[PDB]
Amino acid sequence: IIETKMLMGEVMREAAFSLAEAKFTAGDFSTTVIQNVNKAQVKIRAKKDNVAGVTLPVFEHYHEGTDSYELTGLARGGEQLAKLKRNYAKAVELLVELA
C-alpha cells in the first residue's frame, strides 16, 4: 500500500505541475471554479466485498456525467484546463481504488 501511495504522490506531482501551467497560461480562473458549484460529476456506488467469511466495505467510482464548466473567456483557456481535468479525472479513480 505504501507503493500505491507513493504512486499517488507521483501522480499529484504531475497534477501540481499541470496546475502551475494552468495558472501560467490563463492567469486566474480558480475563483470561478470555486464560485460555481451546484452538482457533482463523479459519485460512489456503495458496495461490500466478501474477501473471506466476513465482509468488508468497498466503493466504486461512478461517472455521473455532469457537463464540465466551459473556460473560453479567460484567454480561451480550454486545452490546458482540459489537460488538468484529465489529470484529476485519473487521480479521482486511483484514489477511489486506494480508498
CA angle (61 as vertex; 71, 50 as ends), nearest 5: 175
C-alpha cell at 72: 473560453
- CB 71 → other proteins: shortest distance, Å? 7
Task: Give, for 13, the enclosing helix (H) or strand (E).
Answer: helix 2-26
Selection from 68, 67, 73, 70 nearest residue 28 by Cα: 73
19 binds other proteins (CB under 8 A): yes
For the chain, the maximum distance between any two Cα atoms, rounded to a whole number of angstroms, is 58
Does 70 sit near other proteins (CB under 8 A)? yes
Residues touching other proteins, count (CB under 8 A): 64
Q: Is 75 in the site for other proteins (CB under 8 A)?
A: yes
Interface contacts to other proteins, rule CB under 8 A: 2, 5, 8-9, 12-13, 15-17, 19-20, 23-25, 27-28, 30-46, 56-57, 59, 62, 64, 66-81, 84-85, 88-89, 91-92, 95-96, 98-99
